[PDB]
Amino acid sequence: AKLSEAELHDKIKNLEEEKAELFEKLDKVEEEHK
Amino acid sequence: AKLSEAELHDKIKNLEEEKAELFEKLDKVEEEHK
Amino acid sequence: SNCGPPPTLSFAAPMDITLTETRFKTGTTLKYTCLPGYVRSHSTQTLTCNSDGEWVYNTFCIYKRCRHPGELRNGQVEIKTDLSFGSQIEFSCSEGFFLIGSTTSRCEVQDRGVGWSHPLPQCEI
Amino acid sequence: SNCGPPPTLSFAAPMDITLTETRFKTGTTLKYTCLPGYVRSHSTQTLTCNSDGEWVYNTFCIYKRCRHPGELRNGQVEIKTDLSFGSQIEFSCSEGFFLIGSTTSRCEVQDRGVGWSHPLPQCEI
């Protein structure tokens, strides 16, 4: 029941940081598994 | 066969940092050896 | 067919300070990591020497972004572009007040992440 | 004949926070280390109390220097003095482009070394 304030920005910050965290998970798995 | 680009600057940066590293090596040897 | 030393990147630096032997076997891959102020945005963080003796790579880092610094009591915090590394926000005070402190602040490198250059000002009187 | 407390130095700070007993035996030597933004440039990093009750020392730190940040696509990176701590570089865009971002950047303290205050701008359109 609440419009997201211009905290769309924080949300964008967090998603980009979670993507980055995924990329690490990716090549970390991909390395040792190869 | 390549003129050093204005990367004389990086080269200067690295040499100063290697001198510093030498100074540490100097007094570290000079300390315990005394 | 082979590569000279790699271009310096504005957003990333090579892992492992190696002698950087001024020449590299075609097909060599070098591992990079994001500079402070930057976060990873691609799976492959490498430059590779291709068949034409050239280093190839994509922009695998993006700007980090600062926390929103919150509200300015009796004032306003104005986003001008975004809250990314390098961007600036502006501060202002409502009609009955004087701004004490800085009118701007900038998302900059702090610790091992990113943060605001100037503290929020106060709106007073 | 003896020394009062040592002068504060702009380029270095004393190792060991000790009570800094306001007076010091003549001939005492205090150990210093380089401040952030500064690198060691002499073997002796000390102030010593001489016979005349005065602290003596030479400038044993110099500025750290930033990596060259690389090229500006479709633009130019202009060194104005050098790339040392405190110095500024300037950015410009070639005839057919608009500069988006900062026109300058400054070598500043970052992490435990030194780095560029602002990210490279883009040259666009």
The domain limits of chain C are 1-63, 64-125
A27·C43 Cβ contact <8 A: yes
Q: Any idea which architecture D64-125 has in CATH? A: Ribbon (2.10)
φ and ψ of B24, to 5 deg: -60, -50
The H helix count followed by the E strand count for chain B is 1, 0
Q: State the chains in contact with A (3 or more Cβ–Cβ pairs under 8 Å).
A: C
Method of determination is: X-ray
Cβ-based burial of C25 (10 A; exposed 0-12, middle 13-18, buried ≥19): exposed
CB-CB contact of D10 with D4 (8 Å): no
What single letter denotes the amino acid at residue D73?
A: R
CB-CB contact of C92 with C78 (8 Å): yes
CB-CB contact of C75 with C124 (8 Å): no
Give the nearest partner residue to C85 out of D68, D69, D119, using CB atoms.
D119
Q: Nearest to residue C36, comparing CAs of C106, C117, C112, C88? A: C112
Distance from CA of D21 to the nearest CA of C (A): 33
Task: Return d(Cα D27, Cα D32) in angstroms, integer.
Answer: 16
Distance from CA of B10 to the nearest CA of D (A): 6
State the first-to-last Cα distance of chain B, in angstroms, to the nearest integer.
Answer: 49
φ and ψ of D57, to 5 deg: 180, 155
Task: Return d(Cα C48, Cα C15) in angstroms, integer.
Answer: 14
Task: Return d(Cα A34, Cα C74) in angstroms, integer.
Answer: 58
SS3 B9: helix
What single letter denotes the amino acid at residue C13?
A: A
Residue recorded with tokens 């005065």: D54
Cβ-based burial of D38 (10 A; exposed 0-12, middle 13-18, buried ≥19): buried
Choose, out of B12, B14, B16, the residue to mutate when testing the contact with D (most D CBs < 10 Å): B16
* Antiparallel, parallel or unpaired: β C122-124 and C98-100: antiparallel
Reading the block at residue C6, the tokens are 């790699």
Identical fold at D1-63 and D64-125? Answer: yes
Task: Return d(Cα D74, Cα C125) in angstroms, integer.
Answer: 50
Resolution in A: 2.6
D66·B13 Cβ contact <8 A: yes
Reading the block at residue C85, the tokens are 């590394």
C86·D111 Cβ contact <8 A: no
C39·A26 Cβ contact <8 A: no
SS3 D69: coil
Distance from CA of C95 to the nearest CA of D (A): 31
Distance from CA of C108 to the nearest CA of D (A): 7
Is the domain C1-63 a CATH 2.50.20.10 member?
no
State the first-to-last Cα distance of chain C, in angstroms, to the nearest integer.
Answer: 71
Reading the block at residue C87, the tokens are 């961007």
| Chains B and A are touching, with contact defined as 3 or more CB–CB pairs separated by less than 8 Å | no
SS3 D65: strand
Bridge partners of C30? C47
Q: Nearest to residue D110, comparing CAs of C13, A10, C18, A29? A: C13
Return the CA Rg of chain A: 15
- E strands present in chain D: 12-14, 29-34, 38-40, 46-49, 55-56, 61-63, 75-79, 88-93, 98-100, 104-110, 113-116, 122-124
